[PDB]
């Protein structure tokens, strides 16, 4: 069984991340945060949680909605960097593969910001400190891709993912950079699924396979619903943007690659059982966040598994989205939709 060899190098990590799980805000703590009047009341009410004394040394009057999520994210990222420094062998590779997906978003953000002639220093902020890679600010030169890959991207770990990307030889606009980002993310999800299948042991293997399948399915549905808009894409040129894994791959990605209107997407998801309750709703991303949280809650029942390191990392990032949504309503007096946070724990 799995507990025999797991705790030789991952027992301290397991115990620390389960203790990190225990600081997730339950449903009553969000109600107590919702009842706050001003933002100092939100600070006092968050001081009685496992965030406690993190907005110390700020002010009583320099407290802003942006600053709250900056500090609440920096806490999360220091915790991730603490767990990754205590890992070795296969867990270190697992956490580097978690990091690469943020590196891709930093790459697309830097290339997009270079085109619109703006400052390098303002693209270097708002640029997600977890996927850093020290040679990143060198991407602000030489606005075509062939002078990017041949100078700075071959040394990055994103270098194997630029295989399907060299069909243009010109400069870049907002459409081409999103095509490059979707192709990089396809190659990333397929390589990380292949790493999970061949090298992670079983109770974490099946959990990470269903979590990465959910990530691939959400990418596929959003690429299909962002391609029926004011554009014209050949249907075999769109099947190169959909990842080859998940539970809607071998049939429904054939139909999503050919959907011409909004009713072609509802017809493609009508056959899959876990979906087709999603396209008649309020928000569409509030189904994906809810289903991701029900998947992450189910991953905390497996006790000897490193999927927990995923399931914590996505849950805590949901939590920082909730607090901001409360802090955007207290600072702006918009209490009408304040109870639309997403809470499972």
């Amino acid at each position: 069984m799995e507990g025999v060899y797991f705790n030789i190098d991952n027992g301290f990590i397991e115990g620390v991340v389960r203790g990190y799980r225990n600081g997730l805000l339950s449903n009553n703590q969000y109600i107590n945060l919702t009842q706050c009047d001003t933002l100092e009341d939100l600070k006092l009410q968050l001081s009685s949680t496992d965030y406690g004394n993190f907005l110390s040394s700020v002010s009583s009057e320099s407290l802003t909605t942006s600053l709250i999520q900056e500090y609440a994210s920096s806490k999360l990222y220091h915790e991730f960097n603490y767990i990754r420094d205590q890992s070795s062998g296969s867990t270190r590779k697992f956490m580097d593969y978690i990091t690469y997906g943020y590196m891709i978003d930093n790459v697309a953000l830097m290339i997009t910001g270079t085109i619109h002639d703006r400052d390098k220093g303002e693209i270097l902020q708002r640029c997600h400190p977890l996927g850093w890679f020290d040679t990143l600010p060198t991407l602000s030169v030489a606005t075509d891709l062939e002078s990017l890959y041949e100078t700075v991207l071959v040394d990055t770990p994103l270098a194997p993912y630029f295989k399907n990307c060299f069909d243009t030889a010109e400069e870049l606009d907002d459409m081409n950079i999103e095509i490059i980002r979707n192709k990089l993310y396809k190659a990333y999800l397929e390589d990380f699924y292949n790493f999970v299948t061949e090298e992670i042991p079983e109770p974490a293997k099946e959990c990470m396979q269903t979590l990465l399948g959910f990530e691939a399915d959400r990418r596929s549905i959003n690429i299909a619903l962002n391609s029926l808009q004011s554009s014209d894409i050949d249907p075999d040129l769109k099947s190169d943007l959909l990842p080859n894994i998940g539970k809607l791959y071998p049939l429904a990605t054939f139909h999503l690659a050919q959907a011409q209107d909004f009713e072609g997407v509802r017809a493609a998801l009508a056959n899959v059982y876990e979906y087709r309750g999603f396209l008649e709703t309020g928000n569409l991303e509030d189904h994906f966040y809810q289903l991701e949280m029900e998947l992450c809650r189910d991953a905390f029942t497996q006790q000897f598994a490193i999927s927990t390191v995923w399931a914590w990392m996505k849950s805590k990032e949901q939590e920082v989205r909730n607090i901001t949504w409360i802090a955007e309503c207290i600072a702006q007096n918009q209490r009408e939709r304040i109870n639309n946070y997403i809470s499972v724990y």
Binding site: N7, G11, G15, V16, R18
Partner: protein, 199 residues
């Protein structure tokens, strides 16, 4: 390439070809496992039983101790009050080796010196066989018991760090998991009950 599997397949090929050679030559009774059991000294079987009993019991205790101890130190960074509460999870893993001490104390009283004639008799061969398999039985049962109680102790430490009202309900599984080593002790003391010393 699975080099150890290649070693396994080479051993199997050599065994099958050798036995088939002995059949077809006409000498299949030269591979005589019963004559090996009468010419081998009973002191070998008795001392392998004692040594493997205490060694395997100690190995199972140590395995269970690091399985429960790693998670108990990791779950004590945020909840340091679980430490002295969950110490009996380690106590259940460490009484596995005291059973191996007890078996090695009982069985070592039967290691007397036999005479040159009256050496490979029925009683001495019986005592060697009984001490060998009794030592293996209690040592293997204690290895299995120690690893199982260690897994349950790690899970109980995680559950105690979560909610303190859960440790009373996960402690029941460590009580079920610890009777296995005591049953191994009882069968080890009963397999060597009628065995005399080496007179």
């Amino acid at each position: 390439f699975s080099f150890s599997h290649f070693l396994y397949y080479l051993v199997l090929i050599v065994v099958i070809v050798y036995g088939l050679y002995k059949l077809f030559t006409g000498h299949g009774s030269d591979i005589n496992f019963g004559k090996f059991l009468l010419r081998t000294s009973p002191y070998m079987w008795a001392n392998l039983g004692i040594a493997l009993c205490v060694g395997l019991s100690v190995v199972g205790a140590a395995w269970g101790i690091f399985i429960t101890g790693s998670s108990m130190i990791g779950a004590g960074v945020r909840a340091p009050r679980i430490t002295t509460k969950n110490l009996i999870s380690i106590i259940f893993c460490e009484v596995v080796a005291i059973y191996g001490l007890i078996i090695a104390i009982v069985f070592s009283s039967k290691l007397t010196v036999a005479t040159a004639e009256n050496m490979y008799s029925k009683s001495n061969l019986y005592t060697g066989y009984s001490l060998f398999w009794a030592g293996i039985t209690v040592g293997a049962s204690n290895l299995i018991c120690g690893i199982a109680v260690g897994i349950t102790g790690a899970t109980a430490a995680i559950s105690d760090a979560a909610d303190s009202a859960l440790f009373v309900k996960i402690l029941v599984i460590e009580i079920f998991g610890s009777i296995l080593g005591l049953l191994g002790l009882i069968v080890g003391l009963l397999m060597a009950g009628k065995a005399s010393e080496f007179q």
